[PDB]
Curated annotation (Swiss-Prot), chains A, B:
Tree of life domain: Viruses
Cytoplasmic side: 1-298
Location of the Peptidase C30 domain: 1-298
Catalytic activity: TSAVLQ-|-SGFRK-NH2 and SGVTFQ-|-GKFKK the two peptides corresponding to the two self-cleavage sites of the SARS 3C-like proteinase are the two most reactive peptide substrates. The enzyme exhibits a strong preference for substrates containing Gln at P1 position and Leu at P2 position
Compartments, record wording: Host cytoplasm; Host Golgi apparatus
Subunit details: Exists as monomer and homodimer. Only the homodimer shows catalytic activity.
Official protein name in the record: 3C-like proteinase nsp5
Residue numbers annotated as active site: H40 (for 3cl-pro activity), C144 (for 3cl-pro activity)
Lineage: Viruses, Riboviria, Orthornavirae, Pisuviricota, Pisoniviricetes
Signal peptide span: none
Record's function text: Cleaves the C-terminus of replicase polyprotein at 11 sites. Recognizes substrates containing the core sequence [ILMVF]-Q-|-[SGACN]. Also able to bind an ADP-ribose-1''-phosphate (ADRP). May cleave host ATP6V1G1 thereby modifying host vacuoles intracellular pH.
Residues of the full protein shown: 3242 to 3539 of 4382
């Protein structure tokens, strides 16, 4: 009854193109007369750990970039680098360009990903930016260049473009200015993310969704202090709850009738005693990739 | 990184319209010069207890049907009834109509839903046709007429149109020929979903996925015949396996080196002994809406 939903992807699908340099092909994002794609499309197998991108790019011309928008080929009439993205200027302006902006999301926030394979969309799913700046997503081969985004109301906010999979199987990428999220670099060398944590604000939002969905089994009559709950949080690898966090859940506390600190006492008990085989909103695990705004939307 | 993924929704988004009849509005599907929507749009609250749809329809003219495609209004040139759908002949032929088919989905197979409200797409999610012919979906007030679909190559196989929420929280509707899935009817009556069973085909796929991911505490060396597995499964309200299911699991069997019937003997043990305390892919309940096809993609 309550499930992860992704935004409708039509407005993004109309921007997906195929960019080929030499023997490497990945996805690009075509907005106005610019194609954005990861720069390592110029890198053959020098991706590790040698790539000098300035050095590899000076040796390229517009001719060395083949860009396909479906069947049509677009003529590249310029190119430049911005952080870890290539910007390819093309002669045609995308007639399907939606209203859009480039935003850098903060950890804990969610977005939809349109997974693409050589310019063609393939699936769409919801995910979140982990506190350690990775995303636990689904990016197969040929997925580089796929974008993450949020929509509201007719405006697409792009927040992520995919670059690489890490040893642990999680994913690393940039905003649409080409700056990585996290400590990572676009080079085929071993790279660790920091130790991840659970997004406490999202677990609480999701506990409200259960109550709002008629699932109260975990509630109790107790209450706890902010610091008293944060003590349990550190012992359980949850990130500390700030007071402004409590204020974000203000609307949900009023609709639910449970004060935020009461929900925290409930969460405290769930963390200490487990769930003993029952379910919350059909899940056996404390879900932390729904934001408060996500929960209000459904 | 095993996530439920929906097909990209753009090809369906450009077909979603708003059908209004008196006081009640819902969604319709606009392909070529016909708009498809549930016939209960013509019912009033009073008429919904025991409607005579042929009676209620002759008492209506083309000019009773307000059909809006975004800003533009479309003029209803004609109207007929196909089972529990209305087919509205429209002024204009949808310029965004894609290659499409109307298919009847089988229990256990999955599709994507584009959840819509007043003709405006809101979100995309993936779900399964349950054995009891309902779907566990996310439909709020205004979602009637929202469609479910799969995309193969460039062709949209429409398979579902949402009609009703049952008392137990799950949902019922029709194919795009207006034939209901299950024994349900489009009247307010005492109907309720029959006993649901678990999609064994998909549980086994999920177990293979778990093995591929390094979870294999549940494998054993006992063996089972197809017949003896099926006798145990049915006693636990699991669907019995068909000859075709065994073949559908071929690829995953070879990829893992675990014979289909050996994975059946693993499941048989989980059914009879339970899992407590152990987890599988992080969960203590066996997932049954991930298909062998979903697993094979990763």
């Amino acid at each position: 009854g309550f499930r992860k939903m992704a935004f409708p992807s039509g407005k993004v699908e109309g921007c997906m193109v195929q960019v080929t340099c030499g023997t490497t092909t990945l996805n690009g994002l075509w907005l106005d007369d610019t194609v954005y794609c990861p720069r390592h499309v110029i890198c053959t197998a020098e991706d590790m750990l040698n790539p000098n991108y300035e050095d590899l790019l000076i040796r390229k011309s517009n001719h060395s970039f083949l860009v396909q928008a479906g069947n049509v080929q677009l003529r590249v009439i310029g190119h430049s680098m911005q952080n870890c993205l290539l910007r390819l200027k093309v002669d045609t302006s995308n007639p399907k360009t939606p209203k859009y902006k480039f935003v850098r999301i903060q950890p804990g926030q969610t977005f939809s990903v349109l997974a693409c394979y050589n310019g063609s969309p393939s699936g769409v799913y919801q995910c979140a930016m982990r506190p350690n700046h990775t995303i636990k997503g689904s990016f197969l081969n040929g997925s580089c260049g796929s974008v993450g985004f949020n929509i509201d109301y007719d405006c697409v906010s792009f927040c992520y473009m995919h670059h690489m999979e890490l040893p642990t199987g999680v994913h690393a990428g940039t905003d649409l200015e080409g700056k990585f999220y996290g400590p990572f670099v676009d080079r085929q060398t071993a790279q660790a993310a920091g130790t991840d944590t659970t997004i406490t604000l999202n677990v609480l939002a999701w506990l409200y969704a259960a109550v709002i969905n008629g699932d109260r089994w975990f509630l109790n009559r107790f209450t706890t202090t902010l610091n008293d709950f944060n003590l349990v949080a550190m012992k359980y690898n949850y990130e500390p709850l700030t007071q402004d966090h409590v204020d974000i859940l203000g609307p949900l506390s009023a609709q639910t009738g449970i004060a935020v600190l009461d929900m925290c006492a409930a969460l405290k008990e769930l963390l200490q005693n487990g769930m003993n085989g029952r379910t919350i909103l059909g899940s056996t695990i404390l879900e932390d990739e729904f934001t408060p705004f996500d929960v209000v939307r459904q």
